[PDB]
Design a protein around this ligand. Structure first.
Ligand SMILES: Cc1ccc(Sc2ccc3n[nH]c(=O)n3n2)cc1
Length: 343
């Protein structure tokens, strides 16, 4: 179990002003720290956020959070469930800012909600330094869906504060799971995100912001556009046929030729955006499954599981390694052509 700690700086809050926090299970003796960003979409205006507060309040408030949580998947401490970092210090950061981890705006007389996702990450890191993070060799910032995009938006800022805070020895790396999206045409019929960013006062990485410039920061929410601007090593996990991608594309699954070509082209576009991502794991599956599920070990690409690929990535960060690959992108063109896809 990971134990809840509400942030000591109570000005860094969830949407409704309650304190943000993190769940922590220390593994002393281990110099590895895994900080996982929870996902859960976002909200982009007052009415849309009001609706999320009725029926998704845990994503907007810490008032009802549990004491503890069980680490699962990559957050598990059992070596059978987590061959990769079972012995690491485990941190689960709940998503309660509804801003894809990009916000830096408080509640005020003018703001019904606070959007502080970018500041929550900074404050968690700062408070963890007094709890052993100061001794880390590697800080892996990981996350799924909205948290996966959050990794891409925040990994370089975490590296920056640790350097500014006087900890240049900590190697900051990113693991973005299911947060790598395409701004493509729907099969049948960006604006919510563009409206979201203005509503949250959202912030994007500095190099990406300087390329796309004022009013175009939404581009930095798309992995293939923000990734090349990043300095920290980032491993990208993305289903070729991600269910959230297909949902926003208005695809729900006999398939006729128009939809067949659309689905096949989407997988190829995906595959193409990962061509120059050296550390990646992209199985040809239709799925919404994420890396904190207990059976995350089962999927393989070209015979290599994700826990193995991540270990090979670790070795690469000490010229490809014999028998221990890091770039694993399926080439077959249809959902579940890979026999190991989740059922
Ligand atoms: C471009 C972009 C748009 C939305 C998000 S946020 C998101 C996207 C999928 C998804 N599936 N399940 C879940 O919670 N999410 N959240 C991130 C980037």
């Amino acid at each position: 179990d990971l134990r809840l700690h509400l942030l000591l700086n109570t000005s860094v809050t969830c949407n409704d002003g309650s304190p943000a926090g993190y769940y922590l299970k220390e593994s002393r003796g281990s110099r590895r720290w895994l900080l996982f960003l929870e996902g859960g979409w976002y909200c982009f205006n007052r009415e849309n956020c009001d609706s999320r507060y009725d029926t998704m309040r845990r994503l907007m408030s810490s008032r009802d959070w549990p004491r503890t949580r069980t680490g699962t998947g990559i957050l598990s401490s059992q070596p059978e469930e987590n061959p990769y970092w079972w012995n690491a210090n485990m941190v689960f950061i709940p998503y309660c800012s509804s801003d894809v981890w990009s916000g830096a705006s408080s509640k005020s007389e003018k703001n019904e909600y606070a959007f502080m996702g970018a500041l929550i990450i900074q404050e968690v890191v700062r408070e963890l330094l007094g709890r052993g993070l100061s001794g880390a060799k590697v800080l892996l910032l990981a996350g799924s869906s909205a948290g996966g995009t959050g990794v891409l938006l925040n990994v370089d800022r975490v590296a920056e504060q640790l350097e500014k805070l006087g900890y240049p020895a900590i190697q900051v790396r990113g693991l973005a799971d299911s947060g790598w999206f395409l701004d493509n045409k729907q099969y049948r019929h960006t604006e919510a995100i563009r409206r979201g960013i203005r509503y949250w006062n959202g912030v994007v990485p500095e190099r990406c912001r300087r390329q796309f410039q004022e009013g175009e920061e939404w581009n930095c929410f798309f992995g293939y556009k923000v990734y090349p601007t990043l300095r920290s090593p980032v491993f990208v996990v993305q289903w070729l046929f991600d269910e959230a991608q297909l949902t926003v594309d208005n695809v729900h699954l006999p398939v006729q030729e128009g939809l067949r070509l659309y689905i096949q082209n989407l997988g190829r576009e995906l595959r193409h955006t990962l061509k120059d991502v050296p550390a990646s794991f992209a199985p040809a599956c239709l799925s919404h499954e994420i890396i904190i599920r207990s059976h995350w070990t089962d999927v393989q690409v070209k015979g290599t599981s994700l826990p193995r690929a991540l270990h090979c990535w670790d070795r690469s960060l000490h010229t490809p390694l014999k028998g221990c690959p890091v770039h694993l992108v399926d080439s077959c063109p249809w959902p579940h052509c890979n026999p190991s896809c989740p059922t």
